[PDB]
A paper describes a structure:
Allomorphy is a post-translational fine control mechanism where the catalytic rate is governed by a conformational switch that shifts the enzyme population between forms with different activities. β-Phosphoglucomutase (βPGM) uses allomorphy in the catalysis of isomerisation of β-glucose 1-phosphate to glucose 6-phosphate via β-glucose 1,6-bisphosphate. The active site of βPGM is located in a cleft formed between the cap domain (T16–V87) and the core domain (M1–D15, S88–K221), and these domains reorient in response to the binding of a phosphodianion group in the distal region of the active site30. Substrate-free βPGM exists as two distinct conformers with different activities due to cis-trans isomerisation of the K145-P146 peptide bond on the multi-second timescale. Allomorphic control of βPGM involves the isomerisation of the K145-P146 peptide bond situated within an allomorphic control loop, which leads to either fully active cis-P βPGM or partially active trans-P βPGM.
Using both solution and crystallography techniques, the structural properties of substrate-free βPGMD10N,[name] were investigated. 1H15N-TROSY spectra of substrate-free βPGMD10N,[name] acquired in standard NMR buffer indicate that it adopts an open conformation and is present in solution as a single trans-A βPGMD10N,[name] population, equivalent to substrate-free trans-A βPGMP146A (BMRB 2792034). In both monomers, Mgcat is coordinated similarly to substrate-free cis-P βPGMWT (PDB 1ZOL21 and PDB 2WHE26) and the position of N10 is analogous to that observed for D10 in substrate-free trans-A βPGMP146A (PDB 6YDK13). In each active site, an inorganic phosphate anion is coordinated by the sidechains of K117 and R49, along with a tris molecule (derived from the crystallisation buffer) that occupies a similar location to the sugar ring of the allomorphic activators. As expected, both monomers exhibit a trans K145-A146 peptide bond with the alkylammonium sidechain of K145 located in a solvent exposed position between the cap and core domains. However, the backbone arrangement of the allomorphic control loop in each monomer is different and neither chain adopts the conformation present in substrate-free trans-A βPGMP146A (PDB 6YDK13). Such observations imply that the trans K145-A146 peptide bond allows access to a broad conformational ensemble for the allomorphic control loop.
Residue numbers in the entry:
A (entry chain B), B (entry chain A): 1 to 219
Write the structure that this text describes.
C-alpha cells in the first residue's frame, strides 16, 4: 500500500488562482489598463510574475522604467497577500478535509508539494496544518515547474521514496512532475486537459481513501 | 420577457462529443495512427468530418486516395451512428427536462439550434421531440464556427426574432454565434473558457426558468 500522499495546493486543496487573478486585475485597473479578464488570465497561469507583468503591460503597449517594473511586481504580491487574509476552512475543496483525516487515521504520511510561497499560511488559515507531516519549501528546491524536485522533496521530508507515494494534481505540468518523481499521479479535472494515461477524477469529492487504494492496487 | 429559448445539443442537452471521440479513435487504431487521444480530440471540435480526418492523417504524414479518404470518413460516421443507437432519456443532462416542461407550461418557444446532423434522431431517442416547436436544419445553413445562422434560423422557425430569445451554449464559438445572432447567451462552463462579459452557470442544473427570467430582467 502507498505510504504517503503528496498534495499540490491550488486546484486540489483550495483555490489560490482566484486571488492571483484579482490581484493582477486590481493592479491593472490601478494603472488603468483594460482587458485583464478571466480568459486573459489563462495566459498568466503557470507563468512567472515578470512574464505575467510583461503580458499585462503589452495590453496597453504601456512603457515603464526598471524601477516602475520592480514596484508593480512588488505591488501585485502585496495585493495577493492582502486578499488571502480572507482564506478560511470554508475554502477547503470538497472531500479534502475528510481525506486528510482518513489518511492520518491510517498512518499514511501527508506532505504538501506546492510552489506556493504562502503554503504554511494558507494551511494554517484553513486549519489543516495539523494533518501535514511536511511542507516542501519551494525556496529550498528552486526548480522549474515541470521538474520532479518539489515532489521528491515532499516525499523525502516525510521519510518515504516517491515510489511509495501518490501525488494529487490538477495540472498537466504537475502530473508530469509527479510521473518524473516516481510517484503515482491521480489527476482532478477533464481528460481533455490531463491525458488518457492516468487515473483522473472529475472533482475532489472523488479523492477518497478507498478510491486511492483501489487505484494503487490496480497499477 | 423572452419568447423563445434556442438550445445547442452537445454539452447542453446531452453529450455526443464522447461518441465522436470513440469513433475517431477506433478509426485511427484501424489505420495504425497513434496520438488520437482526448487532448488531440480538442482540435476536432467544430471541425468538418473531412477536415478532422485530414488532421488525423497528418499525425503520421499519411496519404490516401480521394477514394479511400471518402471511405474512412464514411466508416467513422457509420460507427458514430451505430454508437448513438444507445442514446436514451437517461442521457439528458440534469435540469434540462424540467426546464423544457417549465418553458412549455409558460408558452415559451423551444427550438434546437445545433450543428448536429442527427438532432431530430437524438431528440426522438431522448423523448424530447414533444417539447420542441422547431429544429433548425444545419444542412441549410453555414458551417462556420460562431456563425449566427443556425440561431437565426431556429428563432425564425418558431416565429420570433433572435432579439426575443435566449441561447444556451457550452462553447466559446457558440456564445459568439448567439451574440452575433442578436439573442442573449447564457453559457454553461467556465468563464476562463466562455468569457467574463456574459452570464455563465457552472453546470446545466442551474438552467432554471427562474434563473433565465432573472438574467433577462438584468440584461
Ligand atoms: Mg494545482
Ligand atoms: Mg455545445
Amino acid at each position: 500500500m502507498f505510504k504517503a500522499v503528496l498534495f499540490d495546493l491550488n486546484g486540489v486543496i483550495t483555490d489560490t488562482a482566484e486571488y492571483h487573478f484579482r490581484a493582477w486585475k486590481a493592479l491593472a485597473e490601478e494603472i488603468g489598463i483594460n482587458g485583464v479578464d478571466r480568459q486573459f488570465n489563462e495566459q498568466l497561469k503557470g507563468v512567472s510574475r515578470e512574464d505575467s507583468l510583461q503580458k499585462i503591460l503589452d495590453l496597453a503597449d504601456k512603457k515603464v522604467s526598471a524601477e516602475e517594473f520592480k514596484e508593480l511586481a512588488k505591488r501585485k504580491n502585496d495585493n495577493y497577500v492582502k486578499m488571502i487574509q480572507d482564506v478560511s476552512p470554508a475554502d477547503v475543496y470538497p472531500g479534502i478535509l475528510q481525506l486528510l483525516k482518513d489518511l492520518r487515521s491510517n498512518k499514511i504520511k501527508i506532505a504538501l508539494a506546492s510552489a506556493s510561497k504562502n503554503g504554511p499560511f494558507l494551511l494554517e488559515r484553513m486549519n489543516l496544518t495539523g494533518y501535514f507531516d511536511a511542507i516542501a519549501d519551494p525556496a529550498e528546491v528552486a526548480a522549474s515547474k515541470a521538474a520532479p524536485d518539489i515532489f521528491i522533496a515532499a516525499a523525502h521530508a516525510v521519510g518515504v521514496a516517491p515510489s511509495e507515494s501518490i501525488g494529487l494534481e490538477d495540472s498537466q505540468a504537475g502530473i508530469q512532475a509527479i510521473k518524473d518523481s516516481g510517484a503515482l499521479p491521480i489527476g482532478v479535472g477533464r481528460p481533455e486537459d490531463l491525458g488518457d494515461d492516468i487515473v483522473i477524477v472529475p472533482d475532489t469529492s472523488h479523492y477518497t481513501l478507498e478510491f486511492l487504494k483501489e487505484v494503487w492496487l490496480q497499477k
